[PDB]
Amino acid sequence: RGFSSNMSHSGSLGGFGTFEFTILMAALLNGGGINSNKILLHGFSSYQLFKGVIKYLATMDLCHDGHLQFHSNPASKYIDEGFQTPTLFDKSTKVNILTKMTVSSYQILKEYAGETLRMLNNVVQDQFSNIFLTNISRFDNLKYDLCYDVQLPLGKYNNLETSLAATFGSMERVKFITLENFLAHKITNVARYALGDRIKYIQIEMVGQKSDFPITKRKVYSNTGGNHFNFDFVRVKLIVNPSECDKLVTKGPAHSETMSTEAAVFKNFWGIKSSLRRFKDGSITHCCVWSTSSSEPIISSIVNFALQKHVSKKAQISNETIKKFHNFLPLPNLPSSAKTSVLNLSSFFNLKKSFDDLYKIIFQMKLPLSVKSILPVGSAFRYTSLCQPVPFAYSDPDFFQDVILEFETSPKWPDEITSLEKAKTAFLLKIQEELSANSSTYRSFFSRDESIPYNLEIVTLNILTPEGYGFKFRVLTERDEILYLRAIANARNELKPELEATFLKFTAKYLASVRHTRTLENISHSYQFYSPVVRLFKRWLDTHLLLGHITDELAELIAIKPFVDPAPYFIPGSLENGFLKVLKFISQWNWKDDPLILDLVKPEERLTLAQYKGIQMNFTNLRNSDPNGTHLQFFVASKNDPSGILYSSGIPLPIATRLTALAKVAVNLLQTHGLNQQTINLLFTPGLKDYDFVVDLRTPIGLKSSCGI
Amino acid sequence: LKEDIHTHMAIFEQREAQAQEDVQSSIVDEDGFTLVVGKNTKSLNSIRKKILNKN
């Protein structure tokens, strides 16, 4: 976790360490409770000692309310207040052993206690390598969510007074060791007050720091890029509550007539920008407008002002990765779309409104056999499509979303499979006939579909909605499932697995696809960065040329895997942290001894021990029948598909090995060269490789104004 | 495709009604053996395949 016992007062993640761990274990030996109830006995070994330790650290605060007391010369209890710093009192010394690290470092360590406690107390699966044997401290943006680098060219210790706007006082040099110390404590307090309910946790870490200075020299005598203090530039690492990133108004206290001290310090901290406003509720409250841009998250703008207003007036901020991929996101032709966020879903809601008026006008009419239910299954209906869907945007091949519709269980149906799918075409003929009869402002046509093999006579009904959208309609019946099963049963015995593959494609296209889009569309409103991480993953995967084999639901499942199981990390509060968590995981991931079980559940209906063991057992016999992954490479199993072979089927071994190799090359580049603009451009290079074949294709028109990006 | 699946349904229902009427009209054997049949079954191939699946 990166917690060595050096110091976090000097601006580095650490301070807590191994003998502090010893001291709290032996302090919890003789009690721990408020009545000194024995937290730790040596009746249980290191595993339950460790579990009780993490339980006590996660359920017993030290910073702000309560901390441990003990005296070595002798019970140990839990006193009630907190000293606004990590604290535990040892009265036989009168010392505060946890005052080597700071408030945010203790805060993030209590979070790590809670998180590893959550993934340790469960009796479901085993994750010992997930909890120990992966050094999460290797990368910055992997254990953190986003990063800023403050470059402060202060010049000299005397040039301070016109190069930086911070304090310079006896009262700060008496409590802070040096320049990096007072700027560190000032910058963590102004980041805390600037964001507050805008981020999960802040960690400050001055890089270029070193505890190294030679024999001949009196000090660190080092030109640290515009100063001579032991740090080069300031890592400002943020992990964010992702539900309030792009909320464009933060709120101070309201307006009394007597302008009290909280509104006072709010107006001092925010200067000319923030003011008191009316709202639709009618409250008169202190706030400030944050002009949201697409490429820029407003978290960078608020930290830019909280840097360039208080600690310096000419220092500058380095964060270019977010804007570097945010134009790799495709920007749709929408009104003020540059000022729209990436966490805005107004395009998907616009087609959902168009779909709902279509839904009403297809329910309010008369068939010879009424509608049981229609259910959209589209990638836009699960927030995944690469165009953020603008009306009239034909050039995207998934412009036409697909909606399954099923009538009621009439036992009048034709028998053989071509006849029943032709009867479904007959129903679609009737529905578009009445559609053009009554509401001719919608238009329509028919298109053959061959995404299922060997059924030659299956068409879909495509409609063009005058709000400007296009929907496929595929009729499902209660009969096609048992028709495919009895076709399986009476087929010739050397022709079984191909018809089984046909039925698997049918199940993936019609049946399990509905609960698929239902579950992850329901969970995307709890994991808010899901649609941007899948959209950037899919554009990465098409630049590296895999979508012609892999399916989009499989790419969607590989991208939900770091969200519904993010342990040991956080859920990703930013797009970069999501994307490199994806690629780090799939570079880690094997196939031969590695399935992929995920439960698409809400945080804090799940997958229990029995279903887990059944999934692992059919995986086990599946790939002892399959020796090394000759034709079955991945295994993605959810609650909605305990088979796991539904989306992984069909992809060739060169494509799957190319994906895993590209992931390992990407994590190699990440740990070697670091993040940069040319790093991200090399991460989106085609990797064309000149493997035997290159064609260059250009249709006689350009199609981005027509696709709407 | 209107007239196409019109002709397809118009031959399908013809051979279907013919098959079902042939099923439950009367089946005596070469000797006297009236065949047991369902109330609403439809094909000799259907009862053949279900008597195969109940092997």
Binding site: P368, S410, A426, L429 | K2, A10
Partner: peptide
């Protein structure tokens, strides 16, 4: 009524 003849039997 070609489509009605196609949608008989139901």
């Amino acid at each position: 009524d070609v489509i009605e003849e196609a949608l008989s039997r139901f």
